[PDB]
Ligand binder design. Structure first.
Ligand SMILES: CCCCCCCCCCCCCCCCCC(=O)OC[C@H](COP(=O)([O-])OCC(O)COP(=O)([O-])OC[C@@H](COC(=O)CCCCCCCCCCCCCCCCC)OC(=O)CCCCCCCCCCCCCCCCC)OC(=O)CCCCCCCCCCCCCCCCC
Ligand code: SF4
Ligand code: SF4
Ligand SMILES: [Zn+2]
Lengths: 96, 379, 48, 97, 125, 208, 115, 112, 176, 29
């Protein structure tokens, strides 16, 4: 989800872009500015929420030892969904 | 009596010559002083380990092993048998590399340039072994104060054996080119003669002692890892000159091949680092599965292990001589003081006495036979 | 590949004459190899 | 090596040895660059019981050095730091090179 | 064989420190305060000497933290206050000494939790 | 103990203790303390005036004959009145043993050079002078050995800053390399790694 | 009390004698250093620099510090005479590339926070 | 008679028994001028008397070398010379006297 | 056990003296050395045809640094700063804050490649395999500035080399 | 279930490794 600053420069996923009066834009003249086109926040927002019929489930990021440390997520609260603090995947009980 | 300066490994050398004779030889060092010992005081022990790769940068894992032994002695722990066997095997490989570099560079400075290429092919093969075991060709950082970082890949031993069964012919070719050549003997025989008592009083060690007939080797008198479980002979000189040291180094290469054979045939099973997670980090699966393992990994990679207070001097038989570390611990995870002892320091200090009454061309031969690398000399 | 050559010479790449935007008929370099063929060509694996 | 027989004999005579027995260029005799997965066994402290850390704590067994005649606080035979080192033996494999 | 000279120790001319890093600096001699995030007290055993904080600015490239003083990371450890004071004096540094803060002893009584008539009785446990 | 713990050697410990008592008895004028560590290392603490006598005795005595000087260095402890301690490491090939001799000095008290006892000490004392500022009396030629010419200060002192005071660059106006005060683009990040909850109860100090 | 072991000088008189000997040697050496290093400075300004370096330590009242300073200066002279230094080491005494730092309060207030 | 002891700079000594006897007698003569209660004198007299009795009771050179536990009797002679020189130096130094002075209060306290 | 290297006494009979004289006058050993060089002349050299041929490498080998991400596309880094703490050269600079969705992510991740020692401590300290040292080694630069990597450059390196990086990790992760 | 598998010498060990010097004598009196 790369946006463009009113100056014209691409806004990176950290949201920074040199101001109009910033002299530091001169470093990009006759050259380019590296911006990563894949925004992690959007990509993890596109992941569907997993449906599990268990009160507490574990997430390790997939791949077993190739993921993140295994953590357990509580799904008692129905207002929101359980989110992994490492991977960002979302889990939810089958309401109704 | 004219005074001239051989300016800039890298060495500045001030001499006064009376015709062809060398009257005084004053080496000037510090052109590669990077302040390693002060930098170590600002690092943890694991963080300070990679400095020893760069100290004597022709024999990397030997310095790694010396530092690891010092830290193990201060921690009051021991590595597992397989780690010790791996350490000795790679120390012998490192000795082969170092002696190849020393002999071929000494020949190249005299004017024999072809064995340099001949044996640097073998050096490249051993660098491939280093890269396969650690991921880096030279600045390996493989030997750790708890053992070794990773286990050997599943096909490393067979390739090491394949390399070791062909190296003796390379040594034979080097000997055919150098050993009986009359020009080489005229360049080396009776050059830089040092007596046994003078070598002892001047702080010499290793080949510099053994070429004068002193029967001393740290792997034999004070064995450290498994060196009491392997069999080899110690070459002893008879005249204390450059030729005897050359012969001694070639014989040490052959004996290193012997020790490598024994190590390959007697590699034991088991773990590679001390099974104590408060010193050695746990496995990745354990760190990603168990709470204690994750806590210990976090603490070992952020703070590092604390070492009980004390001071030790640990020395090993490095390929260049006695390499020692005087390590002081104040009880924290950072060393308080780390003094690094290099044999090249004393050898270069004795260079002045070794070169009395010799030609200007003989000083190059004496420098080559002393096996001086300025990374360890300047630190 | 040629398994009868000695190790190191048993695999080689003939570079293309025109990659993304430059004519590489004469100007070739090692960074022109994509990662998978990079892994195969550096003998990190035995499988193309 | 893809060397003709005449060149083989010429180089063998020039060096004075048999070179095809020990070649310095690697060939198919080396190990495969793809290997099966390993297993890497565990250490001795991987037990589920009788494995208290207090019984295997190397760091906590270190103690301050023993004090000998702190100055601030009989026959008596003479002694040496260690017993005299034994003389080495002359390598009954190849005593002289 | 002994001079027996009466003069306070001064080694400023031998340390090689520049002139403006001797007279304009103000070292602080103190026992570091306990990190209130933790209950351990092993970091409040020794005396510390640190220098006054100087300017830090943003590097125009990388936005890193740049400094112009060499003494921004220099911290010394001392057994006693007198040792630190002597070291500061002999090095020609103006110093400020802070007296050690010790947690005063307190009276703890588990039986006071279940009090018959005092306010110390707890409502839950 | 268990296979993760380093084994002890009581025989070497007893031998080193006996030899330390022997040396202390022979030289009561200079020996102040004798220690043997749990990993079998013998240390002898002496008065500074006894450097030459003790070292000569250890080199020349029939029962000691420590003929090799392994290493000579200094350690800086700012909290002591005598700031520096001088450490001598000696090796005896006759008895396959090592010994350590420690003394002390401050910034202004010279230490007698031991180049007459060991020729190897020549460069070690030069290095000590360069890195710590400890002067050695009757040295053949005492001068800097590691630092640059004209370098001011002694870097291995604890109060010397890690990056020093001056830095070098090439100046085109004067067509030579000049020295200027250090200015870091990125300051060295100081890390507070020491944790509370003391680790080794055997080394606990009295609370005074 | 306050009995200390001497380095070279028991009192201040012989310490000043060594100081004067070192000053004589440096004063004699200045023209040879100026010629041999092909310096662009004059002999007068080199001797002025020597005098200034000697005067920076005029406040010392400890004979041990004085004779250690003499030892350091003699090492400096040995480095200069034997041409162990290059021209950059000699010229580092003059700080030609360093912009002057004004001393008054207003200038320091304007430039930054450094007192 | 053997030749080339094997240590560079160490010459072969013919008739080493007489040399050892002379050296030990000179060592004992020097030790005689040291105070009787000094530990150095007692220990060195014991060691020197043991070696001298071993030398005077063994005519065979190789058996004497094996008994003396020094080996290569040439450096046994060298060590005797070193002991004699050290004895003269010890006589001048007089280190059997009490300690010169105690160190400061916390000179050797480690850690800190 | 010890060996003597130079303890051979030449024979003094007439035949051995004549042999040594013939060696001195007719230069036999020099002809032997010439023959050894001639024998080397007629064998295959060890040269490889760079850049068309490459030197052998291993999965363990450490190359240019890269930042990886999960199969879903979110970056693995959680800003724990363990790699920054362990870095022996202080080559890593990290700044972080909660993201717009509340995730724990970095806003700055800088690696100074002119300060890095390529030890690989950072990749073995990372608990989520976020920072790795990939197999690329041909990334020489014409200026100092382009060797000061920021987060965008490292994420681009990860996206560029992910296939080979993942294959190497699959090959080597059972040894770690 | 799965047994231990790591880098080990083959059963019976490796073959002997030549290490002694081999400088042959060609022949001419
Ligand atoms: C000499 C006259 C030319 C023939 C020749 O040199 O043969 C030497 C050839 C040398 O063999 P080798 O290099 O030791 O063996 C490796 C294989 O031949 C390796 O063979 P290859 O498969 O690499 O062969 C490639 C082929 C094609 O090579 C090329 O096209 C490039 C080289 C062109 C050179 C012109 O080589 C040639 O046909 C040219 C041979 C020499 C021509 C001059 O065999 C002999 O002729 C020995 C004859 C006795 C010599 C005394
Ligand atoms: S490889 Fe080593 S030096 Fe480089 S960034 Fe990682 S930890 Fe730091
Ligand atoms: S790269 Fe890994 S170790 Fe470094 S901050 Fe991110 S998650 Fe932590
Ligand atoms: Zn997850």
């Amino acid at each position: 989800g790369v946006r463009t600053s009113p100056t014209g420069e691409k806004v990176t996923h950290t949201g920074q872009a040199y101001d109009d009066g910033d002299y530091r834009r001169v470093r990009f003249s006759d050259r380019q500015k590296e911006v990563n086109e894949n925004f992690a926040i959007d990509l993890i927002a596109e992941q569907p929420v997993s449906e599990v019929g268990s009160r507490v489930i574990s997430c390790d990021g997939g791949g077993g030892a190739l993921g993140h440390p295994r953590v357990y997520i509580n799904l008692d609260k129905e207002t929101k969904t359980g989110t992994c603090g490492y991977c960002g995947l979302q889990f939810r009980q089958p309401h109704h | 009596n004219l005074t001239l300066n051989f300016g800039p490994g890298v060495l500045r050398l001030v001499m006064e010559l009376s015709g062809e004779m060398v009257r005084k030889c004053d080496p000037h060092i510090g052109l590669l002083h990077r302040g390693t010992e002060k930098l170590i005081e600002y690092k943890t022990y694991l963080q300070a380990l990679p400095y020893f790769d760069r100290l004597d940068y022709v024999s990397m894992m030997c310095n790694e092993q010396a530092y690891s032994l010092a830290v193990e002695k201060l921690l009051n722990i021991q590595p597992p048998p397989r780690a010790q066997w791996i350490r000795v095997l790679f120390g012998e490989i490192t000795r082969l590399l170092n002696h190849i570099m020393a002999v071929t560079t000494h020949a190249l400075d005299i004017g024999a340039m072809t064995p340099f290429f001949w044996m640097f092919e073998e050096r490249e093969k051993m660098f491939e072994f280093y890269e396969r075991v650690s991921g880096a060709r030279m600045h390996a950082a493989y030997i750790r104060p708890g053992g070794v970082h990773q286990d050997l890949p599943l096909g490393l031993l067979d390739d090491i054996y394949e390399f070791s069964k062909n190296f003796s012919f390379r040594i034979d070719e080097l000997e055919e080119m150098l050993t009986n050549n009359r020009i080489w003997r005229n360049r080396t025989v009776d050059i830089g003669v040092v007596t046994a008592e003078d070598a002892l009083n001047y702080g010499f060690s290793g080949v510099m002692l053994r070429g004068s007939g002193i029967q001393w080797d740290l792997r034999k008198t004070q064995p450290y890892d498994v060196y009491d479980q392997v069999e080899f002979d110690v070459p002893i000189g008879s005249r204390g000159d450059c030729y005897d040291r050359y012969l001694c180094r070639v014989e040490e290469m052959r004996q290193s091949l012997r020790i490598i054979s024994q190590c390959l045939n007697k590699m034991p099973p088991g773990e590679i680092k001390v099974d104590d997670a408060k010193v050695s980090p746990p496995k990745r699966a354990e760190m990603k599965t168990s709470m204690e393992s994750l806590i210990h990994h976090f603490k070992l990679y952020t703070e590092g292990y604390q070492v009980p207070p004390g001071a030790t001097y640990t020395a090993i038989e490095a390929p260049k001589g006695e390499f020692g570390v005087y390590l002081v611990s104040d009880g924290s995870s950072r060393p308080y003081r780390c003094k690094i002892k290099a044999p090249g320091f004393a050898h270069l200090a004795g260079l002045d006495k070794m070169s009395k009454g010799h030609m200007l061309a003989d000083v190059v031969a004496i420098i080559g036979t002393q096996d001086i690398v300025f990374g360890e000399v300047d630190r | 590949e040629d398994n009868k050559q000695f190790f190191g010479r048993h695999r080689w790449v003939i570079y293309t004459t025109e990659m993304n935007g430059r004519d590489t008929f004469w100007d070739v370099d090692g960074s022109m190899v994509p990662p998978e063929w990079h892994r195969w060509l550096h003998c990190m694996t035995d499988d193309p | 090596a893809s060397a003709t027989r005449v060149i083989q004999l010429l180089r063998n005579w020039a060096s004075g040895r048999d070179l095809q027995a020990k070649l310095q260029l690697r060939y198919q005799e080396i190990s495969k660059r793809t290997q099966p997965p390993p297993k890497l066994p565990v250490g001795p402290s991987h037990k589920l019981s009788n494995n208290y850390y207090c019984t295997r704590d190397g760091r906590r067994e270190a103690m301050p050095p023993s004090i000998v005649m702190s100055s601030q606080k009989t026959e008596k035979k003479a002694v040496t730091p260690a017993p005299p080192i034994k003389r080495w033996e002359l390598s009954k494999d190849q005593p002289y090179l | 064989q002994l001079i027996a000279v009466d003069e306070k120790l001064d080694i400023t001319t031998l340390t090689g420190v520049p002139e403006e890093h001797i007279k304009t600096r103000k070292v602080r001699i103190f026992v570091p305060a306990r990190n209130n995030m933790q209950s351990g007290v092993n970091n409040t055993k020794k005396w510390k000497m640190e220098f006054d904080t100087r300017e830090r600015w943003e590097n125009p490239l990388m936005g890193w933290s740049s400094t112009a003083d060499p003494l921004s990371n220099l911290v010394l450890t001392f057994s006693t206050k007198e040792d630190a004071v002597a070291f500061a004096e002999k090095n020609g540094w103006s110093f400020d000494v802070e007296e050690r803060k010790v947690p005063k002893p307190k009276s703890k009584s588990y039986g006071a939790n279940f009090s018959w008539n005092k306010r110390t009785r707890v409502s839950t446990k | 103990t268990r296979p993760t713990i380093r084994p002890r050697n009581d025989v070497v410990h007893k031998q080193l203790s006996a030899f330390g008592q022997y040396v202390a008895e022979i030289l009561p004028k200079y020996v102040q303390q004798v220690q043997v560590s749990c990993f079998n290392e013998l240390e002898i603490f002496i008065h500074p005036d006894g450097v030459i006598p003790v070292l000569t005795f250890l080199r020349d005595h029939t029962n000691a004959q420590f003929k090799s000087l392994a290493d000579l260095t200094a350690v800086d402890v700012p909290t002591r009145q005598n700031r520096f301690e001088i450490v001598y490491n000696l090796l005896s090939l006759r008895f396959n043993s090592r010994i350590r001799v420690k003394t002390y000095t401050d910034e202004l008290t010279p230490i007698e050079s031991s180049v007459t006892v060991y020729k190897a000490a020549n460069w070690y004392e030069r290095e000590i002078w360069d890195m710590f500022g400890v002067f050695f009396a009757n040295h053949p030629d005492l001068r800097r050995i590691l630092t640059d010419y004209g370098f001011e200060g002694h870097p291995f002192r604890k109060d010397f800053p890690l990056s020093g005071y001056v830095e070098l660059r090439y100046d085109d106006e004067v067509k030579r390399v000049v020295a200027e005060p250090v200015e870091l683009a990125q300051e060295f990040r100081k890390f507070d790694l020491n944790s509370p909850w003391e680790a080794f109860p055997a080394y606990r100090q009295p609370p005074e | 009390g306050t009995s200390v072991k001497p380095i070279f000088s028991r009192d201040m008189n012989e310490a000043k004698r060594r100081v004067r000997e070192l000053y004589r040697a440096w004063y004699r050496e200045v023209p040879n250093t100026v010629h041999l290093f092909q310096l662009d400075i004059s002999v007068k300004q080199g001797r002025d620099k020597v005098r200034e370096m000697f005067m920076k330590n005029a406040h010392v009242t400890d004979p041990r510090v004085v004779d250690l300073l003499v030892i350091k200066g003699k090492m400096e002279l040995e480095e200069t005479i034997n041409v162990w230094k290059q021209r950059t080491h000699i010229m580092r005494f003059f700080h030609e590339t360093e912009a002057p730092r004004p001393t008054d309060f207003l200038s320091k207030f304007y430039v930054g926070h450094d007192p | 008679l053997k030749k080339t002891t094997g240590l560079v700079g160490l010459a072969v000594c013919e008739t080493p028994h007489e040399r050892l006897k002379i050296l030990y007698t000179k060592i004992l003569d020097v030790l005689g001028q040291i105070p009787k209660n000094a530990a150095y004198r007692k220990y060195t007299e014991q060691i020197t008397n043991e070696k001298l009795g071993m030398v005077k009771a063994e005519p065979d050179v190789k058996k004497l070398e094996e008994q003396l536990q020094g080996g290569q009797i040439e450096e046994v002679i060298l060590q005797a010379e070193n002991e004699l020189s050290l004895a003269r130096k010890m006589l001048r130094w007089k280190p059997w006297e009490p300690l010169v002075e105690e160190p400061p209060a916390n000179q050797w306290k480690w850690p800190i | 056990t010890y060996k003597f290297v130079n303890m051979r006494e030449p024979s003094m009979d007439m035949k051995s003296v004549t042999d040594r004289a013939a060696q001195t006058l007719l230069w036999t050993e020099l002809v032997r050395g010439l023959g050894m060089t001639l024998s080397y002349l007629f064998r295959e050299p060890a040269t490889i045809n760079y850049p068309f041929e490459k030197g052998p490498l291993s999965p363990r080998f450490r190359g240019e640094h890269a930042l990886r991400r999960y199969p879903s596309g979110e970056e693995r880094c959680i800003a724990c700063k363990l790699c920054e703490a362990v870095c022996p050269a202080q080559a890593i600079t990290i700044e972080a804050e909660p993201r717009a969705d509340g995730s724990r992510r970095t806003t700055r991740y800088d690696i100074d490649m002119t300060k890095c020692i390529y030890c690989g401590f950072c990749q073995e300290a990372c608990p989520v395999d976020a920072i790795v040292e990939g197999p690329n080694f041909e990334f020489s630069t014409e200026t100092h500035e382009e060797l000061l990597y920021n987060k965008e450059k490292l994420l681009n390196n990860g996206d560029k080399w992910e296939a080979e990086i993942a294959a190497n990790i699959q090959a080597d992760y059972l040894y770690r | 279930a799965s047994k231990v598998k790591q880098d080990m010498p083959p059963p019976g060990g490796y073959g002997p490794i030549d290490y002694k010097r081999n400088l042959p004598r060609r022949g001419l009196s």
